[PDB]
Design brief:
Chain A: This is Cyclin-A2. Chain A: It comes from Homo sapiens (Human). Chain A: GO terms for molecular function: cyclin-dependent protein serine/threonine kinase regulator activity; protein domain specific binding; protein kinase binding. The complex is a heterodimer of chains A (257) and B (302). Chain A has 257 residues and is mainly alpha-helical. Chain A is 61% helix and 0% strand. The relative contact order of chain A is 0.12. Chain B is 31% helix and 16% strand. Chain B contains ten helices and ten strands. In chain B, helix 4 packs antiparallel against helix 6. Chain B starts with a helix and ends in a 16-residue tail after the last helix. Classes of the chains: A mainly alpha (257), B alpha+beta (302). At the A-B interface, helix 1, helix 4, helix 6 and helix 7 of A face helix 2 of B. The structure holds ligand SBC. The site of ligand SBC has 16 residues of chain B, from strand 1, strand 3 and strand 6.
Protein backbone atom coordinates (compact mmCIF):
# COMPACT_ATOMS: atom_id res chain seq x y z
CA UNK A 1 0.00 0.00 0.00
CA UNK A 2 1.15 3.59 -0.47
CA UNK A 3 -0.71 5.43 2.29
CA UNK A 4 1.51 3.36 4.55
CA UNK A 5 3.80 6.32 5.25
CA UNK A 6 1.10 8.99 5.57
CA UNK A 7 -0.68 6.66 8.00
CA UNK A 8 2.34 5.91 10.17
CA UNK A 9 3.01 9.63 10.36
CA UNK A 10 -0.60 10.22 11.34
CA UNK A 11 -0.64 7.48 13.98
CA UNK A 12 2.57 8.90 15.43
CA UNK A 13 0.80 12.27 15.56
CA UNK A 14 -2.31 10.86 17.20
CA UNK A 15 -0.61 8.64 19.78
CA UNK A 16 0.87 11.75 21.36
CA UNK A 17 -2.67 13.09 21.92
CA UNK A 18 -4.67 10.08 23.19
CA UNK A 19 -1.95 9.94 25.88
CA UNK A 20 -3.22 9.44 29.47
CA UNK A 21 -1.63 11.05 32.54
CA UNK A 22 1.41 8.94 33.39
CA UNK A 23 0.92 9.43 37.12
CA UNK A 24 -2.87 9.26 37.40
CA UNK A 25 -2.82 6.22 39.72
CA UNK A 26 -1.10 8.02 42.59
CA UNK A 27 -3.97 10.54 42.38
CA UNK A 28 -6.65 7.87 42.54
CA UNK A 29 -7.82 7.68 46.17
CA UNK A 30 -9.19 4.16 45.99
CA UNK A 31 -7.71 2.10 43.14
CA UNK A 32 -4.20 0.81 42.52
CA UNK A 33 -1.97 -0.64 39.81
CA UNK A 34 -2.72 -4.12 41.14
CA UNK A 35 -6.45 -3.57 40.82
CA UNK A 36 -5.92 -2.36 37.27
CA UNK A 37 -3.75 -5.39 36.46
CA UNK A 38 -6.52 -7.65 37.71
CA UNK A 39 -9.02 -5.74 35.58
CA UNK A 40 -7.04 -5.89 32.36
CA UNK A 41 -6.27 -9.59 32.91
CA UNK A 42 -10.02 -10.15 33.19
CA UNK A 43 -10.64 -8.28 29.95
CA UNK A 44 -8.25 -10.68 28.23
CA UNK A 45 -10.40 -13.55 29.50
CA UNK A 46 -13.57 -11.81 28.37
CA UNK A 47 -11.90 -11.38 25.00
CA UNK A 48 -11.18 -15.11 24.73
CA UNK A 49 -14.71 -16.03 25.84
CA UNK A 50 -16.29 -13.84 23.16
CA UNK A 51 -13.53 -14.32 20.60
CA UNK A 52 -12.85 -10.59 20.32
CA UNK A 53 -9.95 -9.17 18.30
CA UNK A 54 -6.74 -8.20 20.07
CA UNK A 55 -7.28 -4.64 18.83
CA UNK A 56 -10.53 -4.48 20.81
CA UNK A 57 -8.61 -5.39 23.97
CA UNK A 58 -5.96 -2.73 23.33
CA UNK A 59 -8.55 -0.04 22.62
CA UNK A 60 -10.45 -0.84 25.81
CA UNK A 61 -7.31 -0.46 27.93
CA UNK A 62 -6.65 2.88 26.21
CA UNK A 63 -10.17 4.04 27.06
CA UNK A 64 -9.86 2.87 30.65
CA UNK A 65 -6.54 4.65 31.23
CA UNK A 66 -7.75 7.92 29.72
CA UNK A 67 -10.99 7.83 31.71
CA UNK A 68 -9.09 7.13 34.93
CA UNK A 69 -6.73 10.01 34.12
CA UNK A 70 -9.57 12.44 34.85
CA UNK A 71 -12.15 10.58 36.92
CA UNK A 72 -11.86 9.24 40.45
CA UNK A 73 -13.35 5.76 40.55
CA UNK A 74 -13.95 3.52 43.56
CA UNK A 75 -13.02 -0.17 43.86
CA UNK A 76 -16.59 -1.26 43.26
CA UNK A 77 -17.05 0.73 40.05
CA UNK A 78 -13.71 -0.03 38.42
CA UNK A 79 -15.15 -3.10 36.69
CA UNK A 80 -18.13 -1.08 35.46
CA UNK A 81 -15.73 1.33 33.76
CA UNK A 82 -13.80 -1.59 32.28
CA UNK A 83 -16.96 -3.29 31.04
CA UNK A 84 -18.26 -0.15 29.35
CA UNK A 85 -14.81 0.34 27.86
CA UNK A 86 -14.92 -3.17 26.39
CA UNK A 87 -18.45 -2.61 25.07
CA UNK A 88 -17.42 0.63 23.35
CA UNK A 89 -14.25 -0.91 21.88
CA UNK A 90 -16.32 -3.81 20.57
CA UNK A 91 -18.81 -1.53 18.84
CA UNK A 92 -15.91 0.37 17.30
CA UNK A 93 -13.67 -2.51 16.20
CA UNK A 94 -15.74 -5.71 15.95
CA UNK A 95 -17.84 -6.68 12.93
CA UNK A 96 -20.55 -8.07 15.21
CA UNK A 97 -20.02 -6.92 18.83
CA UNK A 98 -21.58 -8.82 21.73
CA UNK A 99 -24.84 -7.34 23.00
CA UNK A 100 -25.09 -5.30 26.19
CA UNK A 101 -26.78 -8.27 27.80
CA UNK A 102 -23.66 -10.36 27.17
CA UNK A 103 -21.39 -7.79 28.81
CA UNK A 104 -23.70 -7.66 31.80
CA UNK A 105 -23.48 -11.46 31.99
CA UNK A 106 -19.68 -11.71 32.20
CA UNK A 107 -19.75 -9.31 35.16
CA UNK A 108 -21.81 -11.99 36.93
CA UNK A 109 -24.72 -9.59 37.30
CA UNK A 110 -22.59 -7.33 39.49
CA UNK A 111 -24.05 -4.44 37.46
CA UNK A 112 -27.29 -3.69 35.62
CA UNK A 113 -27.87 -3.36 31.89
CA UNK A 114 -28.88 0.17 32.87
CA UNK A 115 -25.67 0.85 34.78
CA UNK A 116 -23.56 -0.37 31.87
CA UNK A 117 -25.38 1.78 29.34
CA UNK A 118 -25.24 4.77 31.70
CA UNK A 119 -21.49 4.22 32.07
CA UNK A 120 -21.12 3.96 28.28
CA UNK A 121 -22.64 7.43 27.99
CA UNK A 122 -20.32 8.79 30.71
CA UNK A 123 -17.21 7.21 29.19
CA UNK A 124 -18.14 8.68 25.81
CA UNK A 125 -18.65 12.10 27.44
CA UNK A 126 -15.36 11.95 29.33
CA UNK A 127 -13.49 10.77 26.23
CA UNK A 128 -15.47 13.15 23.98
CA UNK A 129 -16.18 10.38 21.46
CA UNK A 130 -12.50 10.17 20.52
CA UNK A 131 -12.35 6.39 20.21
CA UNK A 132 -10.09 5.84 17.19
CA UNK A 133 -6.98 5.64 19.37
CA UNK A 134 -3.54 4.41 18.21
CA UNK A 135 -2.59 1.09 19.83
CA UNK A 136 0.58 -0.97 20.24
CA UNK A 137 -1.24 -3.42 17.98
CA UNK A 138 -1.57 -0.92 15.15
CA UNK A 139 2.12 -0.04 15.25
CA UNK A 140 3.08 -3.73 15.32
CA UNK A 141 0.94 -4.24 12.20
CA UNK A 142 2.76 -1.43 10.44
CA UNK A 143 6.14 -2.85 11.46
CA UNK A 144 5.28 -6.34 10.25
CA UNK A 145 5.35 -5.11 6.65
CA UNK A 146 9.05 -4.31 7.06
CA UNK A 147 9.71 -7.90 8.04
CA UNK A 148 11.78 -9.41 5.24
CA UNK A 149 11.10 -13.06 5.83
CA UNK A 150 7.66 -12.69 7.40
CA UNK A 151 7.74 -15.11 10.33
CA UNK A 152 4.49 -16.04 12.06
CA UNK A 153 6.17 -17.05 15.32
CA UNK A 154 7.88 -13.67 15.47
CA UNK A 155 4.52 -11.99 14.94
CA UNK A 156 2.85 -14.08 17.64
CA UNK A 157 5.63 -13.43 20.14
CA UNK A 158 5.61 -9.68 19.42
CA UNK A 159 1.84 -9.70 19.92
CA UNK A 160 2.35 -11.55 23.21
CA UNK A 161 4.96 -9.10 24.49
CA UNK A 162 2.84 -6.15 23.41
CA UNK A 163 -0.19 -7.59 25.14
CA UNK A 164 1.72 -8.13 28.38
CA UNK A 165 2.50 -4.41 28.54
CA UNK A 166 -1.22 -3.70 28.90
CA UNK A 167 -1.23 -5.37 32.33
CA UNK A 168 1.24 -3.19 34.24
CA UNK A 169 0.54 0.56 34.33
CA UNK A 170 4.01 0.79 35.85
CA UNK A 171 6.19 1.14 33.86
CA UNK A 172 4.37 0.91 30.51
CA UNK A 173 2.14 3.96 30.95
CA UNK A 174 5.21 6.15 30.40
CA UNK A 175 6.02 4.75 26.94
CA UNK A 176 4.32 5.56 23.66
CA UNK A 177 2.59 2.71 21.78
CA UNK A 178 5.02 3.09 18.87
CA UNK A 179 7.93 2.62 21.29
CA UNK A 180 6.43 -0.37 23.12
CA UNK A 181 5.72 -1.87 19.69
CA UNK A 182 9.31 -1.14 18.71
CA UNK A 183 10.65 -3.05 21.71
CA UNK A 184 8.13 -5.88 21.35
CA UNK A 185 9.07 -6.31 17.68
CA UNK A 186 12.81 -6.38 18.40
CA UNK A 187 12.63 -8.62 21.46
CA UNK A 188 10.40 -11.10 19.59
CA UNK A 189 12.52 -10.99 16.44
CA UNK A 190 15.68 -11.42 18.55
CA UNK A 191 14.23 -14.31 20.55
CA UNK A 192 12.94 -16.25 17.55
CA UNK A 193 15.49 -15.54 14.81
CA UNK A 194 18.39 -13.81 16.55
CA UNK A 195 17.99 -10.88 14.16
CA UNK A 196 17.56 -7.30 15.41
CA UNK A 197 15.56 -4.10 14.90
CA UNK A 198 15.93 -3.78 11.07
CA UNK A 199 17.49 -0.81 9.30
CA UNK A 200 14.30 -0.26 7.29
CA UNK A 201 12.26 0.26 10.47
CA UNK A 202 14.95 2.54 11.87
CA UNK A 203 14.49 4.78 8.83
CA UNK A 204 10.70 4.44 9.00
CA UNK A 205 10.31 5.16 12.71
CA UNK A 206 13.45 7.14 13.40
CA UNK A 207 13.92 4.92 16.45
CA UNK A 208 17.35 3.38 16.93
CA UNK A 209 18.00 0.29 19.00
CA UNK A 210 19.59 2.74 21.43
CA UNK A 211 16.40 4.79 21.74
CA UNK A 212 14.30 1.69 22.38
CA UNK A 213 16.70 0.48 25.09
CA UNK A 214 14.89 1.94 28.13
CA UNK A 215 11.59 0.36 27.07
CA UNK A 216 13.41 -2.73 25.82
CA UNK A 217 15.07 -3.28 29.22
CA UNK A 218 11.65 -3.03 30.89
CA UNK A 219 9.91 -5.36 28.44
CA UNK A 220 12.69 -7.95 28.74
CA UNK A 221 12.27 -7.86 32.52
CA UNK A 222 8.52 -8.43 32.12
CA UNK A 223 9.15 -11.26 29.66
CA UNK A 224 11.58 -12.94 32.06
CA UNK A 225 9.19 -12.69 35.02
CA UNK A 226 6.04 -13.50 33.06
CA UNK A 227 5.69 -17.00 34.60
CA UNK A 228 5.82 -15.48 38.11
CA UNK A 229 3.30 -12.72 37.41
CA UNK A 230 0.07 -12.81 39.42
CA UNK A 231 -1.94 -12.29 36.24
CA UNK A 232 -1.67 -15.21 33.81
CA UNK A 233 -4.50 -14.91 31.28
CA UNK A 234 -2.20 -13.64 28.52
CA UNK A 235 0.36 -16.46 28.90
CA UNK A 236 -2.47 -18.98 28.83
CA UNK A 237 -3.99 -17.38 25.75
CA UNK A 238 -0.64 -17.44 23.97
CA UNK A 239 0.08 -21.11 24.47
CA UNK A 240 -2.82 -21.81 22.08
CA UNK A 241 -2.09 -23.26 18.66
CA UNK A 242 -3.28 -20.11 16.94
CA UNK A 243 -0.29 -18.34 18.52
CA UNK A 244 2.19 -21.19 18.04
CA UNK A 245 2.46 -21.51 21.82
CA UNK A 246 5.03 -18.69 21.83
CA UNK A 247 4.40 -17.97 25.53
CA UNK A 248 6.23 -21.23 26.21
CA UNK A 249 9.33 -20.05 24.37
CA UNK A 250 12.27 -19.27 26.62
CA UNK A 251 13.29 -15.60 26.75
CA UNK A 252 16.97 -14.91 26.09
CA UNK A 253 19.18 -14.32 29.16
CA UNK A 254 20.64 -11.12 27.78
CA UNK A 255 19.78 -8.73 24.96
CA UNK A 256 23.45 -7.94 24.37
CA UNK A 257 22.71 -4.28 23.67
CA UNK B 1 -27.73 18.91 26.39
CA UNK B 2 -31.44 19.81 26.56
CA UNK B 3 -30.31 23.43 26.56
CA UNK B 4 -28.30 23.13 23.37
CA UNK B 5 -31.20 21.41 21.64
CA UNK B 6 -33.46 24.31 22.58
CA UNK B 7 -31.23 26.64 20.52
CA UNK B 8 -32.19 24.68 17.42
CA UNK B 9 -35.22 25.34 15.26
CA UNK B 10 -36.28 22.33 13.15
CA UNK B 11 -37.02 23.56 9.64
CA UNK B 12 -38.00 20.37 7.81
CA UNK B 13 -37.26 16.66 7.49
CA UNK B 14 -34.96 16.06 4.51
CA UNK B 15 -34.09 12.39 4.91
CA UNK B 16 -34.88 9.17 6.80
CA UNK B 17 -33.68 5.62 7.30
CA UNK B 18 -32.75 2.96 9.85
CA UNK B 19 -30.33 5.36 11.55
CA UNK B 20 -33.18 7.73 12.28
CA UNK B 21 -33.85 11.03 10.53
CA UNK B 22 -31.98 14.00 9.10
CA UNK B 23 -33.61 17.41 9.56
CA UNK B 24 -32.63 20.81 8.26
CA UNK B 25 -32.45 23.14 11.24
CA UNK B 26 -31.42 26.65 12.21
CA UNK B 27 -29.40 27.86 15.20
CA UNK B 28 -31.78 30.40 16.78
CA UNK B 29 -28.97 32.46 18.32
CA UNK B 30 -26.42 32.54 15.51
CA UNK B 31 -28.69 31.95 12.53
CA UNK B 32 -26.38 29.21 11.25
CA UNK B 33 -28.15 26.69 9.04
CA UNK B 34 -27.37 23.11 9.87
CA UNK B 35 -28.28 19.44 9.35
CA UNK B 36 -29.45 17.41 12.34
CA UNK B 37 -29.26 13.63 12.17
CA UNK B 38 -31.49 12.34 14.95
CA UNK B 39 -30.90 8.88 16.38
CA UNK B 40 -33.43 7.36 18.79
CA UNK B 41 -31.64 5.26 21.42
CA UNK B 42 -34.66 3.62 23.07
CA UNK B 43 -35.37 1.91 19.74
CA UNK B 44 -33.14 -1.14 20.30
CA UNK B 45 -31.93 -0.57 23.89
CA UNK B 46 -28.34 -1.56 23.13
CA UNK B 47 -26.77 1.83 23.81
CA UNK B 48 -25.19 4.16 21.26
CA UNK B 49 -25.28 2.39 17.84
CA UNK B 50 -22.03 1.19 16.28
CA UNK B 51 -22.77 3.37 13.26
CA UNK B 52 -22.91 6.50 15.42
CA UNK B 53 -19.78 5.42 17.32
CA UNK B 54 -17.90 5.05 14.06
CA UNK B 55 -19.32 8.04 12.20
CA UNK B 56 -18.70 10.44 15.08
CA UNK B 57 -15.26 9.21 16.13
CA UNK B 58 -13.91 8.93 12.60
CA UNK B 59 -15.57 11.98 11.14
CA UNK B 60 -14.35 14.24 13.93
CA UNK B 61 -10.81 13.29 12.87
CA UNK B 62 -11.45 14.23 9.24
CA UNK B 63 -11.38 17.95 8.55
CA UNK B 64 -11.35 18.49 4.81
CA UNK B 65 -13.34 20.59 2.30
CA UNK B 66 -14.62 17.49 0.52
CA UNK B 67 -15.80 15.63 3.63
CA UNK B 68 -19.02 16.62 5.37
CA UNK B 69 -18.19 18.54 8.52
CA UNK B 70 -19.49 17.30 11.86
CA UNK B 71 -20.16 20.43 13.91
CA UNK B 72 -21.40 18.90 17.12
CA UNK B 73 -22.94 16.01 19.04
CA UNK B 74 -25.76 16.35 21.54
CA UNK B 75 -26.37 13.31 23.76
CA UNK B 76 -29.53 13.66 25.83
CA UNK B 77 -31.22 10.90 27.83
CA UNK B 78 -33.09 9.29 24.93
CA UNK B 79 -31.68 10.93 21.81
CA UNK B 80 -28.33 11.36 20.14
CA UNK B 81 -28.00 14.22 17.66
CA UNK B 82 -25.22 14.66 15.14
CA UNK B 83 -24.95 18.24 13.90
CA UNK B 84 -23.44 18.73 10.42
CA UNK B 85 -22.83 21.58 8.03
CA UNK B 86 -25.81 21.80 5.65
CA UNK B 87 -25.74 20.83 1.98
CA UNK B 88 -28.62 21.15 -0.47
CA UNK B 89 -28.72 17.77 -2.15
CA UNK B 90 -27.19 14.33 -2.77
CA UNK B 91 -25.61 13.18 -6.06
CA UNK B 92 -28.31 10.61 -6.67
CA UNK B 93 -31.13 13.17 -6.70
CA UNK B 94 -28.98 15.39 -8.92
CA UNK B 95 -28.27 12.57 -11.36
CA UNK B 96 -32.00 11.84 -11.66
CA UNK B 97 -32.77 15.51 -12.30
CA UNK B 98 -30.03 15.55 -14.93
CA UNK B 99 -31.31 12.53 -16.87
CA UNK B 100 -32.64 14.60 -19.77
CA UNK B 101 -29.63 16.86 -20.31
CA UNK B 102 -26.96 14.83 -18.56
CA UNK B 103 -24.30 16.23 -16.24
CA UNK B 104 -21.77 18.34 -18.21
CA UNK B 105 -18.38 16.67 -18.51
CA UNK B 106 -16.62 19.66 -16.97
CA UNK B 107 -18.73 19.31 -13.82
CA UNK B 108 -18.29 15.51 -13.81
CA UNK B 109 -14.55 16.10 -13.90
CA UNK B 110 -14.77 18.61 -11.06
CA UNK B 111 -16.86 16.32 -8.86
CA UNK B 112 -14.63 13.29 -9.47
CA UNK B 113 -11.63 15.47 -8.73
CA UNK B 114 -13.04 16.59 -5.38
CA UNK B 115 -14.28 13.13 -4.44
CA UNK B 116 -10.76 11.80 -4.95
CA UNK B 117 -9.38 14.62 -2.79
CA UNK B 118 -11.73 13.75 0.05
CA UNK B 119 -11.13 10.04 -0.39
CA UNK B 120 -7.35 10.51 -0.46
CA UNK B 121 -7.65 12.42 2.80
CA UNK B 122 -9.71 9.60 4.34
CA UNK B 123 -7.24 6.92 3.27
CA UNK B 124 -4.13 8.81 4.36
CA UNK B 125 -5.85 9.05 7.75
CA UNK B 126 -6.51 5.30 7.83
CA UNK B 127 -10.26 5.55 7.28
CA UNK B 128 -12.21 3.41 4.80
CA UNK B 129 -15.59 4.75 3.70
CA UNK B 130 -16.90 1.40 2.44
CA UNK B 131 -20.27 2.71 1.28
CA UNK B 132 -19.55 5.21 -1.47
CA UNK B 133 -22.68 5.59 -3.55
CA UNK B 134 -24.51 8.57 -5.13
CA UNK B 135 -26.91 9.16 -2.21
CA UNK B 136 -24.00 9.42 0.27
CA UNK B 137 -22.32 12.19 -1.74
CA UNK B 138 -23.48 15.75 -0.99
CA UNK B 139 -23.35 18.83 -3.20
CA UNK B 140 -24.07 22.54 -2.77
CA UNK B 141 -24.91 25.36 -5.19
CA UNK B 142 -21.26 26.50 -5.39
CA UNK B 143 -20.12 23.37 -7.20
CA UNK B 144 -18.65 21.59 -4.20
CA UNK B 145 -19.17 17.92 -3.41
CA UNK B 146 -18.41 16.10 -0.13
CA UNK B 147 -18.28 12.52 1.18
CA UNK B 148 -20.96 11.82 3.78
CA UNK B 149 -22.52 9.06 5.85
CA UNK B 150 -19.57 7.43 7.62
CA UNK B 151 -21.82 5.00 9.50
CA UNK B 152 -20.11 2.01 7.90
CA UNK B 153 -16.70 3.67 7.91
CA UNK B 154 -13.82 1.81 9.55
CA UNK B 155 -10.38 2.71 10.84
CA UNK B 156 -7.78 0.38 9.38
CA UNK B 157 -4.67 0.86 11.51
CA UNK B 158 -5.37 -2.85 11.79
CA UNK B 159 -6.74 -4.63 8.65
CA UNK B 160 -10.55 -4.65 8.38
CA UNK B 161 -12.15 -8.09 8.16
CA UNK B 162 -14.85 -8.64 5.54
CA UNK B 163 -18.40 -9.10 6.72
CA UNK B 164 -19.59 -12.67 6.22
CA UNK B 165 -22.69 -10.82 5.04
CA UNK B 166 -21.25 -7.97 2.93
CA UNK B 167 -22.36 -4.39 3.56
CA UNK B 168 -21.23 -2.32 0.53
CA UNK B 169 -24.25 -1.62 -1.74
CA UNK B 170 -24.34 -4.29 -4.48
CA UNK B 171 -24.06 -2.07 -7.58
CA UNK B 172 -20.95 -0.43 -6.19
CA UNK B 173 -19.37 -3.49 -4.59
CA UNK B 174 -15.80 -4.33 -5.68
CA UNK B 175 -15.06 -7.75 -7.26
CA UNK B 176 -12.58 -8.80 -4.53
CA UNK B 177 -15.47 -8.56 -2.10
CA UNK B 178 -17.84 -10.54 -4.31
CA UNK B 179 -15.14 -13.21 -4.66
CA UNK B 180 -14.87 -13.42 -0.87
CA UNK B 181 -11.57 -11.68 -0.05
CA UNK B 182 -10.52 -11.76 3.62
CA UNK B 183 -9.90 -8.04 4.12
CA UNK B 184 -11.14 -4.76 2.70
CA UNK B 185 -8.56 -2.32 1.36
CA UNK B 186 -8.56 1.24 0.12
CA UNK B 187 -9.21 -0.27 -3.33
CA UNK B 188 -12.88 -1.02 -2.65
CA UNK B 189 -13.54 2.72 -2.21
CA UNK B 190 -11.76 3.53 -5.49
CA UNK B 191 -13.82 0.88 -7.25
CA UNK B 192 -17.04 2.49 -5.99
CA UNK B 193 -15.85 5.88 -7.21
CA UNK B 194 -15.12 4.36 -10.62
CA UNK B 195 -18.65 3.01 -10.88
CA UNK B 196 -19.96 6.42 -9.92
CA UNK B 197 -17.70 8.16 -12.41
CA UNK B 198 -19.07 6.04 -15.27
CA UNK B 199 -22.66 6.42 -14.04
CA UNK B 200 -22.39 10.21 -14.23
CA UNK B 201 -20.92 9.96 -17.72
CA UNK B 202 -23.48 7.56 -19.24
CA UNK B 203 -26.58 8.35 -17.16
CA UNK B 204 -26.90 4.65 -16.32
CA UNK B 205 -25.47 2.54 -13.49
CA UNK B 206 -22.38 0.68 -14.66
CA UNK B 207 -23.04 -2.68 -12.97
CA UNK B 208 -26.66 -2.90 -11.78
CA UNK B 209 -26.72 -6.44 -10.43
CA UNK B 210 -29.79 -8.25 -9.10
CA UNK B 211 -27.73 -10.55 -6.88
CA UNK B 212 -24.14 -11.22 -5.87
CA UNK B 213 -23.57 -13.67 -8.71
CA UNK B 214 -25.46 -11.41 -11.16
CA UNK B 215 -23.37 -8.44 -9.99
CA UNK B 216 -20.18 -10.43 -10.48
CA UNK B 217 -21.18 -11.57 -13.98
CA UNK B 218 -22.18 -8.10 -15.18
CA UNK B 219 -18.68 -7.03 -14.25
CA UNK B 220 -17.09 -10.02 -16.02
CA UNK B 221 -19.27 -9.35 -19.03
CA UNK B 222 -17.93 -5.79 -19.28
CA UNK B 223 -14.32 -6.06 -18.12
CA UNK B 224 -13.73 -9.67 -19.15
CA UNK B 225 -13.52 -12.70 -16.88
CA UNK B 226 -10.28 -12.28 -14.88
CA UNK B 227 -7.60 -14.98 -14.94
CA UNK B 228 -4.36 -15.64 -13.06
CA UNK B 229 -2.51 -13.40 -15.53
CA UNK B 230 -4.76 -10.35 -15.12
CA UNK B 231 -5.19 -10.90 -11.39
CA UNK B 232 -2.76 -13.35 -9.73
CA UNK B 233 -4.73 -15.32 -7.17
CA UNK B 234 -8.27 -14.90 -8.55
CA UNK B 235 -8.77 -18.63 -9.12
CA UNK B 236 -7.72 -19.28 -5.53
CA UNK B 237 -10.27 -16.95 -3.92
CA UNK B 238 -13.08 -18.42 -1.76
CA UNK B 239 -16.10 -17.78 -3.97
CA UNK B 240 -14.29 -18.17 -7.29
CA UNK B 241 -15.60 -21.02 -9.44
CA UNK B 242 -13.61 -22.41 -12.41
CA UNK B 243 -17.00 -22.99 -14.02
CA UNK B 244 -17.37 -19.23 -14.46
CA UNK B 245 -18.20 -18.27 -18.05
CA UNK B 246 -15.18 -16.79 -19.81
CA UNK B 247 -16.20 -13.40 -21.22
CA UNK B 248 -13.93 -11.00 -23.09
CA UNK B 249 -13.12 -7.42 -22.11
CA UNK B 250 -15.54 -5.09 -23.93
CA UNK B 251 -14.00 -2.11 -25.73
CA UNK B 252 -13.94 0.79 -23.25
CA UNK B 253 -14.83 3.36 -25.88
CA UNK B 254 -18.19 1.56 -26.05
CA UNK B 255 -18.63 1.27 -22.29
CA UNK B 256 -18.22 5.03 -21.70
CA UNK B 257 -18.68 6.55 -25.20
CA UNK B 258 -18.58 10.22 -24.07
CA UNK B 259 -15.09 9.96 -22.56
CA UNK B 260 -11.84 10.81 -24.31
CA UNK B 261 -8.51 8.98 -24.10
CA UNK B 262 -7.66 10.38 -20.65
CA UNK B 263 -11.10 9.69 -19.22
CA UNK B 264 -11.04 6.10 -20.44
CA UNK B 265 -7.54 5.67 -19.05
CA UNK B 266 -8.45 6.87 -15.55
CA UNK B 267 -11.66 4.84 -15.32
CA UNK B 268 -9.94 1.63 -16.40
CA UNK B 269 -7.27 2.19 -13.76
CA UNK B 270 -10.02 2.66 -11.17
CA UNK B 271 -11.75 -0.55 -12.28
CA UNK B 272 -8.54 -2.57 -12.48
CA UNK B 273 -9.22 -6.14 -11.22
CA UNK B 274 -6.19 -6.75 -8.99
CA UNK B 275 -6.82 -4.49 -5.97
CA UNK B 276 -3.07 -4.23 -5.42
CA UNK B 277 -2.84 -2.64 -8.86
CA UNK B 278 -6.07 -0.62 -8.80
CA UNK B 279 -5.06 3.05 -8.79
CA UNK B 280 -5.00 5.01 -5.52
CA UNK B 281 -6.94 8.24 -4.93
CA UNK B 282 -3.56 9.96 -4.47
CA UNK B 283 -2.28 8.77 -7.87
CA UNK B 284 -5.65 9.30 -9.58
CA UNK B 285 -5.40 13.01 -8.71
CA UNK B 286 -2.20 13.26 -10.73
CA UNK B 287 -3.77 11.65 -13.79
CA UNK B 288 -3.74 13.92 -16.90
CA UNK B 289 -7.54 13.71 -17.02
CA UNK B 290 -7.58 16.46 -14.36
CA UNK B 291 -5.07 18.60 -16.28
CA UNK B 292 -7.77 21.18 -17.00
CA UNK B 293 -10.17 20.69 -14.09
CA UNK B 294 -12.34 23.67 -13.07
CA UNK B 295 -15.17 24.32 -10.60
CA UNK B 296 -18.48 24.68 -12.51
CA UNK B 297 -21.66 25.40 -10.56
CA UNK B 298 -24.52 22.91 -10.99
CA UNK B 299 -28.06 23.75 -11.99
CA UNK B 300 -29.70 22.56 -8.78
CA UNK B 301 -33.47 22.36 -9.16
CA UNK B 302 -34.04 23.07 -5.49
N1 LIG C 1 -27.22 10.02 6.10
C1 LIG C 1 -26.63 11.18 6.42
O1 LIG C 1 -25.75 11.18 7.29
C2 LIG C 1 -27.06 12.47 5.69
N2 LIG C 1 -28.04 12.52 4.69
N3 LIG C 1 -28.18 13.79 4.26
C3 LIG C 1 -29.01 14.13 3.32
C4 LIG C 1 -28.51 14.56 2.05
C5 LIG C 1 -29.36 14.93 1.01
C6 LIG C 1 -30.75 14.89 1.22
S1 LIG C 1 -31.78 15.35 -0.08
N4 LIG C 1 -31.27 16.88 -0.69
O2 LIG C 1 -33.27 15.49 0.43
O3 LIG C 1 -31.69 14.24 -1.33
C7 LIG C 1 -31.30 14.47 2.46
C8 LIG C 1 -30.43 14.09 3.52
C9 LIG C 1 -27.25 14.63 4.98
C10 LIG C 1 -26.55 13.77 5.89
C11 LIG C 1 -25.58 14.33 6.98
C12 LIG C 1 -25.13 15.82 6.78
C13 LIG C 1 -25.96 16.66 5.77
N5 LIG C 1 -25.91 18.00 5.49
N6 LIG C 1 -26.81 18.28 4.53
C14 LIG C 1 -27.46 17.12 4.18
C15 LIG C 1 -26.94 16.08 4.94
Amino acid sequence: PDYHEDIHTYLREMEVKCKPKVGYMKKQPDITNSMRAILVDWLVEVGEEYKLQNETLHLAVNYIDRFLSSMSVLRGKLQLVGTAAMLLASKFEEIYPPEVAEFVYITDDTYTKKQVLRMEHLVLKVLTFDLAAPTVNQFLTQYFLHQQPANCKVESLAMFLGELSLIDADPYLKYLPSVIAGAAFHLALYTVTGQSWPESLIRKTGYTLESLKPCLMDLHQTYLKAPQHAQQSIREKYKNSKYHGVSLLNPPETLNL
Amino acid sequence: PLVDMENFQKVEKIGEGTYGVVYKARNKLTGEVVALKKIRLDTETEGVPSTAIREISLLKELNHPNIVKLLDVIHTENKLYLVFEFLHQDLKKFMDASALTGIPLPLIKSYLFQLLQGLAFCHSHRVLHRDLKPQNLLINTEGAIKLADFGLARAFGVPVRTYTHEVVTLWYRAPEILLGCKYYSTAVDIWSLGCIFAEMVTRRALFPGDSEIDQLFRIFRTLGTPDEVVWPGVTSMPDYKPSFPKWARQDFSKVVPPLDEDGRSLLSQMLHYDPNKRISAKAALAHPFFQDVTKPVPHLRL
